[PDB]
Design a protein around this ligand. Structure first.
Ligand SMILES: *[C@@H]1O[C@H](CO)[C@@H](O)[C@H](O)[C@H]1NC(C)=O
Ligand SMILES: *[C@@H]1O[C@H](CO)[C@@H](O)[C@H](O)[C@H]1NC(C)=O
Ligand SMILES: *[C@@H]1O[C@H](CO)[C@@H](O)[C@H](O)[C@H]1NC(C)=O
Ligand SMILES: *[C@@H]1O[C@H](CO)[C@@H](O)[C@H](O)[C@H]1NC(C)=O
Lengths: 170, 56, 57, 57
């Protein structure tokens, strides 16, 4: 729904980036690692600024369960990714399981995702892919966020202040 | 003629859209606003021109 | 298939029921099967079509 | 497809509600139960009039 997101962001006049789950204290049993080679910064391997690619720590990826309550007057845009490895061995390598899934629920929606492991033509040196997903969380709403692997968690999700006449041009 | 020219509105009443159908909502809205501005324009212009022509 | 998950509680429920539908053409048949989680039809209905009608609030 | 259903019903001038599978005779090995607390009627726990929430028996 990229095209839909571009439309949702077209009416945003401003936003507040929030740390939602920003630190090792939000994720004591998960770490941020995985393939960073293709999202480099000034020549150094790296990861997206607003997303945390979580892998297991010390061999484990505990069932992940986190939630966010939108205790703000503004809507919050939450982005997530789901990892889709090129091979089964690359899922196991991140301590994600074969039966990994991502489940995202709010009072108004539910979506469940599973990995689709496949060899892809190589793009930007990668044979795998990450799909990106999102929702707009209404004030007072709560997202219950769960995973059994392949989760790229939100960071700098943001509050939207709406207006009009604005949009995206190239 | 002015009366006969309008097509009785046996058309869609309105439509609802989902959360992830914002582009479809906006397309529908654009279509309604477009047609509304076109018909407001045509209706008022027809009346202004016909009124000027009638008085003339 | 079911998608079991904890939801924010809405109207005192942590679960949900999704609703689905179809329009069955004359002479057509629906074969309906389940291994659980089924909420079966009752008072399904025949539609008589017309025009100028619609839904307003 | 709620929005689509609202559109399909917009052209319905009338309909006939049918019992399709209305009774214990349609469902001898299934029953109607499950959570009724949130779809109450005049204070009594209940279920939707046009749908049968089936559970095992
Ligand atoms: C991290 O794992 C330990 C051991 O299972 C658990 O007690 C602790 O609550 C976990 N941390 C969080 C934030 O869930
Ligand atoms: C940024 O764009 C340049 C374009 O020359 C490309 O070579 C580089 O790999 C890109 N880096 C990232 C992280 O997308
Ligand atoms: C109910 O179960 C019995 C025993 O398995 C079976 O013989 C009977 O046909 C079932 N009823 C219906 C309507 O299928
Ligand atoms: C019907 O609407 C009233 C509104 O005050 C609400 O309190 C009640 O729980 C609703 N009942 C059902 C079955 O939806």
């Amino acid at each position: 729904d990229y095209e839909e997101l571009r439309e949702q962001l077209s009416s945003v006049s401003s936003f507040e980036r929030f740390e939602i789950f920003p630190k090792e204290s939000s994720w004591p049993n998960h770490t941020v690692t995985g393939v960073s080679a293709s999202c480099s910064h000034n020549g150094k391997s790296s990861f997206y600024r607003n997303l945390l690619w979580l892998t297991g720590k010390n061999g484990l990826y505990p069932n992940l369960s986190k939630s966010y309550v939108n205790n703000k007057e503004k809507e919050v845009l939450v982005l997530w990714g789901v990892h889709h490895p090129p091979n089964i061995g690359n899922q196991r390598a991140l301590y994600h399981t074969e039966n990994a899934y991502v489940s995202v629920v709010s009072s108004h929606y539910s979506r469940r995702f599973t990995p689709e492991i496949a060899k892809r033509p190589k793009v930007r040196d990668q044979e795998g892919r990450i799909n990106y997903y999102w929702t707009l969380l209404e004030p007072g709403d709560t997202i219950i966020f769960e995973a059994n692997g392949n989760l790229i968690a939100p960071w700098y999700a943001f509050a939207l202040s709406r207006g009009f006449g604005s949009g995206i041009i190239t | 003629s002015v009366i006969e020219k309008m097509n009785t509105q046996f058309t869609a009443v309105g439509k609802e859209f989902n959360k992830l159908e914002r582009r479809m909502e906006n397309l529908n809205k654009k279509v309604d606003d477009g047609f509304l501005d076109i018909w407001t324009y045509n209706a008022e212009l027809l009346v202004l021109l016909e009124n000027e022509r009638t008085l003339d």
